Structure formats: structure tokens, C-alpha cells
């Protein structure tokens, strides 16, 4: 019926990925579920989970993350999202250090932090021709 046994029991929708997620990048979300719960696809309609390993492919990181946020309502937490380039170039994305970004984990450095409030930003006229 389906290419892989771990795919959710989805009947296919004309809202899945397109030619872009065959030559630029595609995103895969994996998770393990205790029950074959019925959930709503980020793209189309209702799909059925597998009582075990579940693997879904999407065209955007936002679609995978919306599916994962929906999974949290099913008490599912072990979901992990990967980015796949045109060949099998798998990169773990969402649980980047194994801890969700909302929980503080040691080993993270601040990126994009300014040691002042908004009012300390430089005047644009002094940022001309650089």
C-alpha cells in the first residue's frame, strides 16, 4: 500500500511536497507513538499514526514543526526533525542538542545578543556607506 511500513496511514494529499523537495531540500520528522492515534496532517487531512516508529516527509521545516507541536498534544515528545539535501545529506535540526530550545541546556552560547537595550542602537546617519 505504502512505500515504507513506518509511514503514517495517510491516503495522500495534493498538498505535499513538490519538485522543490527533490532538488533543493526536504524535511523528515520521525517519532514513536504508543497508540495508532488519528492526527491531522500539516498539509492535507487526517492520517493515522503507527503503534511504533512513524516517519513523515515534508517540504518545509515549519510544516514538520507544526506536526511536532501537534504531537505534543498526544503526549509525544521524542519527535525529531531532519533536513535532507538533494542527496541523502541528513542533518538533525529541531532537537539540536537533544534538549528542546525552550529548556536551558549547558553548552549553548548566545547568538545575536546585544549588551544594551533598544535605545542604545546607533543612529542610521552614522551607518552610511559601509
Amino acid at each position: 500500500k505504502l512505500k515504507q511500513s513506518d509511514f503514517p496511514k495517510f491516503e495522500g494529499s495534493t498538498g505535499g511536497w513538490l519538485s522543490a523537495a527533490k532538488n533543493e531540500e526536504k524535511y523528515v520528522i520521525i517519532w514513536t507513538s504508543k497508540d495508532a492515534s488519528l492526527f491531522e496532517m500539516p498539509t492535507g487531512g487526517t492520517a493515522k499514526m503507527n503503534a511504533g516508529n512513524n516517519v513523515a516527509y515534508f517540504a518545509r521545516k515549519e510544516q514538520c514543526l507544526a506536526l511536532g507541536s501537534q504531537l505534543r498534544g498526544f503526549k509525544i515528545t521524542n519527535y525529531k526533525i531532519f533536513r535532507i539535501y538533494p542527496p541523502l545529506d541528513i542533518t538533525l535540526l529541531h532537537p539540536f542538542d537533544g534538549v528542546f530550545p525552550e529548556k536551558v541546556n549547558q553548552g549553548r552560547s548566545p547568538v545575536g545578543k546585544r549588551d544594551a537595550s533598544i535605545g542604545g542602537n546607533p543612529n542610521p546617519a552614522s551607518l552610511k556607506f559601509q
Binding site: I118, N121, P124
Partner: protein, 148 residues
């Protein structure tokens, strides 16, 4: 009628100036966006947060004031053209009486003088004014596409 239309012109000038001056002075920031200078002259918005920030940039002030400039110039040109049409035709009493109320304008300037233009081509023939009727309809169409 000249008194009332001059006051309408003054209102148009003051409102266009209000929009433009508000956009110029509030360009560097306001209470809704105290760092607007960091986003440049033209940016879409600052998002739906803080109640909604549609048309918050200084470019949007120009964009809104263009409508008021067009309206004010339309009032000025309507006044000039109707006054001079009555002067040239000789019925200056038509302007002096009907220019004091809006229906006077709508009936005696637009509806009255639009008759030669719309009959630039009819199911019976056409005149050298046919191109002007086509341009009339073309302008209406472009106006409504702008409305889109």
C-alpha cells in the same frame, strides 16, 4: 461658491500637509515603534503585535498622502474648470447658484459636461472625441484595478 470651494481647498492642503508632516516627524520613531529609524524609510510593518502596525513606516505616510494630494488637486481643478466653463459659455449664473451645494457640482459640472465625452462613440457612430471616451473608460478601469 468661491468661498466654500476655497475652504475645501484649504482643508485638502491642511490634511495632505498633516499626513506628510506626521510621516516626516514620526519617521525616526513613535510610541508604537520607538526604533523606526532602524528599519529604514520604507518597510512593510512591524508585525501584528502591540495591537497591529499596518502602514507604520514613513513611506506609508507618503502613500496615504498621495490620495489626499490627488483629491485636493481634483478639487482645485474641478473648481477651475467649472468656473471657466461657465465663464466661457456665458452662464456664470449657473456656477454662482449651483456651486454652493454638492448636488449642484455633481449635476451641473460632471453629469452635464460629461454628455459630449460619453457620446464619442455610440451604437450609431463616432466622433474625433472617441479616443477621449476610450481614455475615460480606461482611466476608470485602471482606477478600479488600483482598488484591487
Amino acid at each position: 461658491g468661491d468661498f466654500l470651494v476655497h475652504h475645501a481647498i484649504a482643508l485638502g492642503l491642511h490634511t495632505t500637509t498633516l499626513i506628510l508632516v506626521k510621516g516626516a516627524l514620526d519617521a525616526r520613531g513613535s510610541k508604537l515603534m520607538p526604533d523606526k529609524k532602524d528599519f529604514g524609510y520604507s518597510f512593510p510593518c512591524d508585525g501584528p503585535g502591540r495591537g497591529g502596525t499596518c502602514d507604520i513606516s514613513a513611506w506609508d505616510a507618503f502613500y496615504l498622502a498621495m490620495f489626499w494630494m490627488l483629491n485636493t488637486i481634483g478639487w482645485v481643478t474641478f473648481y477651475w474648470h467649472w468656473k471657466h466653463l461657465t465663464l466661457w459659455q456665458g452662464n456664470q449664473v449657473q456656477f454662482n447658484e449651483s456651486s454652493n451645494y454638492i448636488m449642484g457640482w455633481l449635476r451641473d459640472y460632471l453629469w452635464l459636461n460629461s454628455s459630449p465625452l460619453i457620446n464619442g462613440y455610440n451604437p450609431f457612430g463616432m466622433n474625433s472625441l472617441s479616443v477621449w471616451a476610450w481614455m475615460f473608460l480606461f482611466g476608470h478601469l485602471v482606477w478600479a484595478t488600483g482598488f484591487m
